[PDB]
Design a protein around this motif. Structure first.
Motif, PDB file in Angstrom:
ATOM      1  N   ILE C   2     -10.661  -3.459  -7.260  1.00 47.31           N
ATOM      2  CA  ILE C   2     -10.575  -4.556  -6.310  1.00 47.31           C
ATOM      3  C   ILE C   2     -11.223  -4.112  -5.006  1.00 47.31           C
ATOM      4  CG2 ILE C   2      -9.065  -6.027  -4.969  1.00 47.31           C
ATOM      5  CD1 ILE C   2      -7.706  -4.430  -8.096  1.00 47.31           C
ATOM      6  N   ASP C   3     -11.878  -5.054  -4.335  1.00 44.62           N
ATOM      7  CA  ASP C   3     -12.532  -4.807  -3.058  1.00 44.62           C
ATOM      8  C   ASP C   3     -11.535  -4.935  -1.909  1.00 44.62           C
ATOM      9  OD1 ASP C   3     -14.267  -4.596  -0.938  1.00 44.62           O
ATOM     10  OD2 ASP C   3     -15.438  -6.382  -1.456  1.00 44.62           O
ATOM     11  N   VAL C  10      -4.609  -2.956   3.882  1.00 47.00           N
ATOM     12  CA  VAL C  10      -3.893  -2.756   2.630  1.00 47.00           C
ATOM     13  C   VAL C  10      -2.747  -1.791   2.887  1.00 47.00           C
ATOM     14  CG1 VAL C  10      -4.040  -1.859   0.279  1.00 47.00           C
ATOM     15  CG2 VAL C  10      -5.932  -3.226   1.267  1.00 47.00           C
ATOM     16  N   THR C  11      -1.521  -2.236   2.622  1.00 48.40           N
ATOM     17  CA  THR C  11      -0.341  -1.394   2.743  1.00 48.40           C
ATOM     18  C   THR C  11       0.606  -1.661   1.586  1.00 48.40           C
ATOM     19  OG1 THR C  11       0.841  -2.989   4.125  1.00 48.40           O
ATOM     20  CG2 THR C  11      -0.520  -1.362   5.226  1.00 48.40           C
ATOM     21  N   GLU C  40     -10.463   4.624  -0.416  1.00 41.19           N
ATOM     22  CA  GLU C  40     -10.836   4.352   0.976  1.00 41.19           C
ATOM     23  C   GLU C  40     -10.943   2.869   1.324  1.00 41.19           C
ATOM     24  OE1 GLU C  40     -14.424   6.303   2.116  1.00 41.19           O
ATOM     25  OE2 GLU C  40     -14.435   5.482   4.153  1.00 41.19           O
ATOM     26  N   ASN C  41     -11.900   2.170   0.719  1.00 42.46           N
ATOM     27  CA  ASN C  41     -12.052   0.731   0.870  1.00 42.46           C
ATOM     28  C   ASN C  41     -11.918   0.000  -0.447  1.00 42.46           C
ATOM     29  OD1 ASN C  41     -14.397   1.469  -0.415  1.00 42.46           O
ATOM     30  ND2 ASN C  41     -15.767   0.552   1.091  1.00 42.46           N
ATOM     31  N   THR C  42     -11.287   0.618  -1.428  1.00 46.89           N
ATOM     32  CA  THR C  42     -11.220   0.085  -2.770  1.00 46.89           C
ATOM     33  C   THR C  42      -9.955   0.595  -3.432  1.00 46.89           C
ATOM     34  OG1 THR C  42     -12.378  -0.190  -4.867  1.00 46.89           O
ATOM     35  CG2 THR C  42     -12.514   1.971  -3.791  1.00 46.89           C
TER      36      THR C  42
END
Ligand SMILES: [Mg+2]
Ligand SMILES: [Zn+2]
Lengths: 218, 122, 164, 37
Positions: C2-3, C10-11, C40-42
RNA sequence: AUAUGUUAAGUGGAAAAGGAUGUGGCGUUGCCCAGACAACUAGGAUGUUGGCUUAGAAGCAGCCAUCAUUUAAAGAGUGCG
RNA sequence: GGUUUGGCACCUCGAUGUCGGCUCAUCGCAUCCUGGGGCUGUAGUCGGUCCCAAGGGUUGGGCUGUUCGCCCAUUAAAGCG
RNA sequence: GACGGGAUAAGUGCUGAAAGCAUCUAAGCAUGAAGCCCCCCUCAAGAUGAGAUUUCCCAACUUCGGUUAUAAGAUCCCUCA
């Protein structure tokens, strides 16, 4: 929301302003008083304890309910009140009103209001089936012998028992009753008399009890 | 109160003089009737001539009841007889006259052609 | 996977998760038997096994994180047109009014992150973040007059067609 | 609906699924809506 | 209690023809990276209903004569009508 | 299913009284009406068929000893056991 | 006879995988009948789980445990509905 006591005395005629004859009940709220105020804090429900007929002071060597045993007097001296014969409660009332120990005069009610009532029914002894329940009698002639008795109770050699809900000669009378959706006509504070449309379960000088209806439509 | 197998006079120009009350239209097995209540009747005799005959079967509207009605003003009324009038669900009669006066509470049921004719609305 | 696009935080805390975005913020829960990481971003899905049920929760939970993450940035919309004569619709107040040949109008009320949008008297749309909410609400509308079979006089999604 | 204890796809598009233990079918043609029990 | 699996139905703790993408097992075997299945977008035949036709019916009334090449590639139409 | 006509001859022969009707009801649901629904060769009113549902209600008379049945006139319906 | 609310069957859905699609469902969320329940009328603490509240009565006999005629109160008796 409100409610009082009273006494059926009699029924009369009285006319509408369109000329419509309108029957009527008479009731007397004479000498209503509040005695005690039962909170939810202690008892578990919020209500109002009430009294209607003045009776007299403590006995000396004395006898029945015309006079007063001490505990009643111990309850009526409490809130600066004279002892009372009929005591009844009223739940579903604005208990925030009605300080302990005042009057519940007819002026709480108003013409046009709708009400229910409560009261004992009338004296009636061992009454047969068709007068207690309204069952249908049996034949006269064509030779019969079954005129009025309650018929065949039940089923057979199987289903041997007789079920509880059957219908038999017992007393017909003493019963609490309620009559939803009556209306009020008038409030004469002079004689402390009220008038209620329709007719109520009571004998003359019997007990009658009132409150604001619940099924207004809500 | 008018009910099954009740014989009545009549009021109109029929060629008929009395009837029989088979059924008393309404609800789910009404037994009774009063002023205003339409009914299903037949014919048990006849004067000669006239449209209707013996053995016929037609409706009717009750009027001139013997245990009269209570008006909401608190007034009552009583005739001596029982009677009816023949009808065809125009709610307008066959006949041309009405003898034998009428009870007015017909008016609530929106009957006016017979009320045009009746001495008197009472 | 997922992006996690721009400004979409995101938590995760075991079973419950909170995700943030420009058009609002969500707080959904999951099945705790699942397992998770944040790269990191994914995002990195886990399942504990090749058990039957676990496959369901795996692909499913992909779909739900996708739903939140797309809703917060983009949000979702539905096109509930009206077609017929006497049919009229208009956001009036916070609530909607309708007029469909019934003897009475109709009221409808919203939730947070809801918007009873309108273009004109005979077409509407709601646009929100939770795909779930907007569609459930959409059927609570469409259930009021389903598409009649002959002419199509009634509420409908757009691509929905006629069936005598 | 056509409830029948015998169920079998009446045409090609009729697709089979289980809903609540029970069996049903869908086709997008309502006149092929079948339930088993 | 021990070891090993099965059941998701209160089956257990009454019942058949028949039906089904419920699951588990033992096998046969097809298609699969010189990139399968599956869905999405990308194209759909050229002449030509073509012969004989059928209300017109030009994938199609159906009786079939049903050829090649524009061509990734497509049948005198896979097909939905 | 165990409401019918039947088969069986297990209780009953020092007695288990049977048809139908009156009063009384009580229950099941394989629903007759109302309530909700799916489909339609459902344009609408009226409908046909299937599903959930047994909370309440389920008429007067003519005719026969009558269950049954025919008929009259009603009724939202005039249920099967 | 209600109005009204809570949970519901048949059914309609939303999101959605197992099975990248579709999928009302297995995880999840809603919705929906005079039916169930709650509300409406009544009875009802021998509900031996014997309820709770207000008020009232309150000694002497050293058997120590216990006894007493009395207290508040109710009754016997009588006039009457
Ligand atoms: Mg005779
Ligand atoms: Zn099909």
């Amino acid at each position: 929301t409100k409610g009082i006591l009273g006494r059926k005395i009699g029924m009369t005629q009285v006319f509408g302003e369109n000329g419509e004859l309108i029957p009527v009940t008479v009731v007397e709220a004479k000498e209503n008083v509040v005695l005690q105020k039962k909170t939810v804090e202690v008892d578990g429900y919020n209500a109002i304890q009430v009294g209607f007929e003045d009776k007299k002071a403590y006995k000396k060597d004395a006898k029945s309910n015309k006079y007063a045993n001490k505990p009643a007097e111990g309850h009526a001296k409490k809130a600066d009140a004279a002892p009372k014969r009929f005591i009844r409660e009223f739940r579903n009332v604005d208990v925030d009103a009605y300080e302990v120990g005042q009057e519940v005069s007819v002026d709480t009610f108003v013409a046009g209001d709708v009400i229910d009532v409560t009261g004992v029914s009338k004296g009636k002894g061992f009454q047969g089936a068709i007068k207690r329940h309204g069952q249908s009698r049996g034949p006269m002639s064509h030779g019969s012998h079954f005129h009025r008795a309650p018929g065949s109770v039940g089923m057979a050699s199987d289903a041997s028992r007789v079920f509880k809900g059957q219908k038999m000669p017992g007393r017909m009378g003493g019963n609490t009753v309620t009559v939803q959706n009556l209306e009020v006509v008038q409030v004469d504070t002079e004689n402390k008399v009220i008038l209620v449309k329709g007719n109520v379960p009571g004998p003359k000088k019997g007990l009658v009890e009132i409150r604001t209806s619940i099924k207004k439509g809500n | 109160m008018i009910q099954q197998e009740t014989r009545l006079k009549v009021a109109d120009n029929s060629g008929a003089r009395e009837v029989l009350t088979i059924k008393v239209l309404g609800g789910s097995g009404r037994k009774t009737a009063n002023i205003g209540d339409v009914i299903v009747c037949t014919v048990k005799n006849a004067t000669p001539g006239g449209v209707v005959k013996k053995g016929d079967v037609v409706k009717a509207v009750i009027v001139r009841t013997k245990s009269g009605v209570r008006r909401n003003d608190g007034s009552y009324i009583k005739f001596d007889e029982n009677a009816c009038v023949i009808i065809r669900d125009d709610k307008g009669p066959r006949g041309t006259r009405i003898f034998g006066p009428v009870a007015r509470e017909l008016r609530e049921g929106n009957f006016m052609k017979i009320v045009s004719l009746a001495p008197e609305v009472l | 996977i997922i992006d996690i696009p721009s400004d979409v935080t995101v938590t995760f805390d075991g079973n419950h998760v909170t995700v943030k975005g420009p058009k609002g913020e969500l707080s959904r829960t999951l099945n705790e038997r699942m397992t998770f990481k944040q790269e990191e971003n994914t995002i990195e899905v886990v399942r504990p096994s090749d058990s039957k049920e676990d496959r369901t929760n795996h692909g499913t939970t992909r779909a739900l994180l996708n739903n939140m993450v797309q809703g917060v940035s983009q949000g979702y919309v539905k096109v509930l047109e009206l077609v017929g004569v006497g049919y009229r619709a208009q956001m009036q107040g916070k609530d909607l009014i309708l007029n469909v040949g019934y003897s009475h109008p109709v009221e409808i009320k919203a939730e947070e992150n809801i918007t009873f949008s309108v273009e004109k008297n005979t077409v509407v749309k709601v646009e929100g973040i939770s795909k779930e909410q907007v569609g459930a609400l959409a059927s609570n509308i469409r259930s009021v007059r389903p598409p009649e079979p002959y002419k199509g006089k009634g509420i409908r999604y757009q691509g929905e067609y006629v069936r005598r | 609906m056509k409830v029948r204890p015998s169920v079998k796809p009446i045409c090609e598009k009729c697709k089979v699924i289980k809903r609540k233990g029970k069996v049903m079918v869908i086709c997008e043609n309502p006149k092929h809506k079948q339930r088993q029990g």
